[PDB]
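Reference record
================
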Amino acid sequence: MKEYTLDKAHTDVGFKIKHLQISNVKGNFKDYSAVIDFDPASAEFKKLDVTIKIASVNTENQTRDNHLQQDDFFKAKKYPDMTFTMKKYEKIDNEKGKMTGTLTIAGVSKDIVLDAEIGGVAKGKDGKEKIGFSLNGKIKRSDFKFATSTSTITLSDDINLCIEVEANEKE
């Protein structure tokens, strides 16, 4: 035989091991419209109807946003928009209420509840009205038969909706 000595400089005592990491995908939609009827005298919503252009999704990542439009997600070609239609507002107090509405994702419709939190009601600079409110709730992918090919292991069955709205009076 013959005896050798490592050359520490071009030697690597290496290892690889696979692990999982949980992370939140956050995301909004750049393009959407809404009709908002609100009575500041009673802090009740009267009508809230939203249409969102699936195309305008943004999860800060171009290759994912494109993939969201495909058959195994939104199917934007066939179902270009998602809609929410308020059916009922149940006041808790002036800061808080339970909103019940019909959500439609890719042609499937289910009634959801959002927690309305009125974060501020004002008269503006110009003496015309404003409001700032939030709508929060959790919806289940499974309830909408949405992305059914993707396992609830890889991607959570729960989506957390956070609608943050500032809004001004009309005409």
Summary: The chain has one domain: 22-171. DSSP finds one helix and nine strands in the chain. The first strand starts at residue 28 and ends at 29. The beta strands are 28-29, 32-39, 44-53, 57-58, 81-91, 96-105, 108-123, 129-140, 158-168.
